[PDB]
Structure 1
Amino acid sequence: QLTAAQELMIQQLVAAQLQCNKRSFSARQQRFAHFTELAIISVQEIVDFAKQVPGFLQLGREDQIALLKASTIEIMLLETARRYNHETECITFLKDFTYSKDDFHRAGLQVEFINPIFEFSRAMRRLGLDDAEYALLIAINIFSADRPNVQEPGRVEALQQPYVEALLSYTRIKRPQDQLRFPRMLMKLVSLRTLSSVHSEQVFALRLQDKKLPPLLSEIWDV
């Protein structure tokens, strides 16, 4: 019962994620450097992906920037959960680039942020999302009309709706017996906002730690 428009929107998102990912990824100062290098790569990958999401380029440049400024850490955390290895309790950012809890801590993050990231990753895992579902959830995250500094929130909201609708229809076919899978996925967007909040506290704490974000991350995350 997916419409052709919905099937095509999903295929575009799944293909763009694959393409963007292929393009982008084909003492304690080293660990912080390495970790921020992954972030700068991902920041680019997300910009590249968002440009492929239908409707995104219909917004004004300032709104495109404002949506990406808020979404980027949340999408990074989605992509982190997607790469969670439950067997050894780690995140496989890249073939071999694996991070455990202590590796996050040695990069500069506190336990108050680390543990919720792993709790979120386990919650995500229990949902058993597929490529279509991740990609739809990322599109829905991007078109959040409530982000700071959005000039056309109505337009954003309107661009979100077909993605929400497609997710609703897709999930109703994937698991006709589990009506509640769809709202539990939307609830992961709630958790991501809190995670984003804690992230901003972690960035703040770098200052009276010993550390400075590199320029490309300072732009998006230092306020």
Structure 2
Amino acid sequence: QLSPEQLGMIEKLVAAQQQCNRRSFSDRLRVTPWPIAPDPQSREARQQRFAHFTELAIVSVQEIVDFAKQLPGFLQLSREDQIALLKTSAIEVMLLETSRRYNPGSESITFLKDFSYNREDFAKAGLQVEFINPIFEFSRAMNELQLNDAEFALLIAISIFSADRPNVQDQLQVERLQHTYVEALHAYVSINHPHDPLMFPRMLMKLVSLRTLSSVHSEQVFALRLQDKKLPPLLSEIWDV
């Protein structure tokens, strides 16, 4: 079963996501606008789409940091461990949040309510198909799961508390923290999907997929260097290094 303690914790997580995200929404004008330029061979237009996308990403990372800070146990880690956890889980959480915003009907992804994009939009910014396609496939697949706010929030917490990240010092404590969310998610899905006990394993296996997607992402990062399309300081720090 789920204890009141556990139901409270889940509520806190979900409320934190809502809080963090409302802060993102009102930051939305900081993002370089999407160009209306009519010419697919315009290099300036391309750069501006890339500026727009990388700036959206920065908002995402900001939201992810704000969220982690509210996870019980996170701020009790050394700063080195907080940084080791966030640096490598950012792309994974960003992927989960993205799948959350995938529309199967138009096959598009919508950020901050007003910015909707399909595969061709992402390619018009210079992103390669072997980055785009797997992410759309991940999104569709996640979309199929039909997870609710509680289940995303826990899966996000489980992803963040991954002790095998490079440079984690206190692995014991990170696993102990992760185990809380794992146990909670398990009780949650057995209670809320009583006729689908496979939902639990399906979800944990998404953590495996995120590893592949993280490697795909790193290959896109490199590909960007080849075009000399430079990442913003924050993104460069967490990914170029």
Provide TM-score, normalisation by structure 1.
Answer: 0.98
Distance 2:56 2:94 in 1: 10
List aligned pairs for 1:1-223, cutoff 5 A.
1-26=1-26, 27=44, 28-223=46-241
Structure 2: stretches of 5+ with no match in the other structure: 27-43
Distance 1:149 1:117 in 2: 27
Q: CA deviation at 1:71?
A: 0.5
Distance 1:173 1:142 in 2: 24
* Bigger Rg, which one: 2
CA-to-aligned-CA distance 1:61-88 (integer Å, 9 cap, x gap): 0000110000001101101000000000
Q: CA deviation at 1:178?
A: 0.4
Letter in 1 for 2:177: L
CA-to-aligned-CA distance 1:103-124 (integer Å, 9 cap, x gap): 1112232111111111111111
Q: Which runs of 4+ in 1 moved over 3 A?
A: none
Q: CA deviation at 1:209?
A: 1.2
Aligned length: 223
SS of the equivalent of 2:91 reads: helix
Distance 2:63 2:114 in 1: 19
Aligned partner of 2:38 in structure 1 is none
SS of the equivalent of 1:57 reads: coil
Q: CA deviation at 1:40?
A: 0.9
Distance 2:82 2:213 in 1: 22
Distance 2:151 2:157 in 1: 10
Letter in 2 for 1:62: E
Provide TM-score, normalisation by structure 2.
Answer: 0.91
- CA RMSD, Structure 1 to Structure 2 (Å): 0.8
Distance 2:22 2:137 in 1: 28
Distance 1:172 1:36 in 2: 39
Distance 2:150 2:21 in 1: 15
Identity of aligned residues (%): 78
Q: CA deviation at 1:94?
A: 2.1
Q: CA deviation at 1:196?
A: 0.6
